[PDB]
Every structure is written in structure tokens, then in C-alpha cells.
């Protein structure tokens, strides 16, 4: 009981800590400095965490990385779009 | 067996994806733009993940956030030092 709350407590802080940065990027479409390779590596891990979370029945790990996915994936999309404009 | 390997696989990619950014910050001591509040929130969650990882017997979650701690904490330290120089 208290142990799941701990994970959700953790998930809340780590996910929303730098969330305003991703939101700003999505809003302004400014992707200068963003590495495509780093985000692909990052997303690869995020997907793997989701698989891990399912196999572990860990909703804390699950919701943390699902929200991360919904924040990171649009950032990479915009980055790839801006990259191709040149 | 394969499920723990999945977590370690995930931990490898998410932790080392943006690790060169933290290393660069530690090396150059350039902390412009870094929010103290965001890192304190982030570290609060990281610590909570560690507690969660211990209570879950999850070495994937554990090693991911311990390494994160060793990367994030020095960044905040340098940030607080640079902040006080003014
Ligand atoms: C998130 C966008 C990255 C841009 C740079 C952000 C700088 C913040 C400092 C380090 C990177 C964040 C660490 C990675 C945060 C990813 C969150 C995650 O994957 O959760 C997994 C948990 O289930 C297991 O603990
Ligand atoms: C905006 C990014 C693209 C979003 C597309 C949809 C995102 C799908 C994310 C995860 C799919 C896996 C869902 C698994 C549910 C786990 C629940 C369970 O069975 O315990
Ligand atoms: C099973 C996981 C499948 C997930 C597939 C994800 C593919 C990407 C899908 C949608 C990308 C996000 C689109 C959101 C639009 C936001 C506006 C913008 O980014 O410009
Ligand atoms: C450089 C940052 C400061 C580092 C200080 C030391 C870091 C300590 C990090 C975590 C301490 C908790 C260790 C718990 C071990 C878990 C193993 C287990 O019992 O399963
Ligand atoms: C149980 C967890 C206790 C952890 C306490 C952590 C307190 C901070 C300790 C050390 C800070 C990191 C010091 C590393 C020096 C790197 C060089 C530098 O940052 O300038």
C-alpha cells in the first residue's frame, strides 16, 4: 500500500520536474540543441521500461514512462520536422 | 531472468541517453539555464525511486536512479555554487 504510494510519489516528481521544458519545446517548436540520437536512445529505454513495468506489474514504473513517452515523442517529432526543413 | 535483463536494458538507455549532458556540465561547470527548483524536485523523486526500488527488490530501478543520483547531485552542487558567486 504505502510502497506503491512511494513509487507514485517518485513518479510524480521525476516526471514533472522537467516537464515544463518539454511543454515549452512543444509549444514553441524550438528544438535547437536537441540531439535526435539521444532522444531515440531515450525513447528506446522508455519503451523498454513500459515492457518492464508490465512484466513486473508495476504501475508506478508504467505511468511514469507512459507520461514520459507522451512528452518525449512529440519533442522528437518536432525535432525531425525542423531538421528536415533545411 | 529475461525480465530483469529488460529492466537493465531500459536502465542502460534512459540513464546514458543524456548522460553526456551532465558530464559536460560537471566538466565545464557551466550551469546557465539550470533551475535549482527543478533539480531539487528531480532529486526528491530519484531518492524516492531508490526507496521504491529497495522495497520492490528491483535492481533495475535501483541502479538506474543511483547512477542518476551520481550525475544529478553534482550538477545541482555546481549550480548552487555558481548561483552564490553573484
Ligand atoms: C526527459 C527529457 C530529457 C532532457 C534532459 C533532461 C535533463 C534531466 C536530467 C536527467 C535526465 C532524466 C532522467 C531520465 C528520466 C526518464 C524517466 C524514466 O524513464 O522513468 C523510469 C523509471 O520507471 C525508473 O526510474
Ligand atoms: C504521443 C505518443 C504516442 C502515444 C501512442 C500510445 C501510447 C501507448 C503507450 C503504451 C502502450 C502500452 C499500454 C500497456 C498498458 C499496461 C496496463 C497493464 O496491462 O498492466
Ligand atoms: C505502441 C506504441 C505506438 C506509438 C506510436 C507513436 C508514433 C507517433 C504518434 C504520434 C506523435 C505525436 C503526435 C502529437 C502531436 C503533437 C503536435 C506536434 O508534435 O507537433
Ligand atoms: C554523489 C552523490 C552522493 C552519493 C552518496 C552515496 C549515494 C547513496 C545512494 C543510495 C544509498 C542506498 C543504497 C541501497 C542499496 C540497495 C541494495 C539493497 O539492499 O537491495
Ligand atoms: C543517503 C544519501 C546521502 C547523499 C548525500 C549527498 C550529499 C552531496 C555529496 C557529494 C556531492 C557530490 C560531490 C562530487 C564532487 C564533484 C565535483 C563537483 O561537483 O564540483
Numbering used by the authors:
A (entry chain A), B (entry chain A): 2 to 87
From the paper:
The SWEETs mediate the facilitative diffusion of sugars, by allowing solute permeation across biological membranes down a concentration gradient. SWEETs possess seven transmembrane (TM) helices, consisting of a pair of 3TM repeats and an additional helix that spans the membrane to connect these two repeats, resulting in the ‘3+1+3’ arrangement of TM helices. Their bacterial homologues, the SemiSWEETs, have only three TM helices. Previous studies have shown that the SemiSWEETs assemble into dimers to function as sugar transporters, and thus they are considered to be an ancestral form of the SWEETs.
We crystallized EcSemiSWEET by the lipidic cubic phase (LCP) method and obtained crystals belonging to the space group P21212 (Crystal-I). The structure was determined by the Se-Met single-wavelength anomalous dispersion (Se-Met SAD) method and subsequently refined to 2.0 Å resolution against the data set from a native crystal. A total of six TM helices from two protomers create a central cavity that is widely open to the intracellular side. This cavity penetrates into the dimer core, but is completely occluded from the extracellular side and the lipid environment by the tight association of the extracellular regions and the surrounding TM helices, respectively. Hence, we designated this structure as the inward-open conformation. The high-resolution structure of Crystal-I revealed the presence of a monoolein molecule occupying the cavity of the inward-open state. The glycerol head group of the monoolein molecule is located in the pocket formed by symmetrically arranged residues in the dimer core. Within the pocket, the hydroxyl group of the glycerol head group forms direct and water-mediated hydrogen bonds with the side chains of Asn66. Given that glycerol and sugar share similar polyol moieties, the glycerol head group of the bound monoolein molecule is likely to be mimicking the sugar substrate. In the present structure in the inward-open conformation, the putative substrate-binding pocket is occupied by the monoolein molecule mimicking the substrate sugar, indicating that the observed structure represents an inward-open, substrate-binding state.
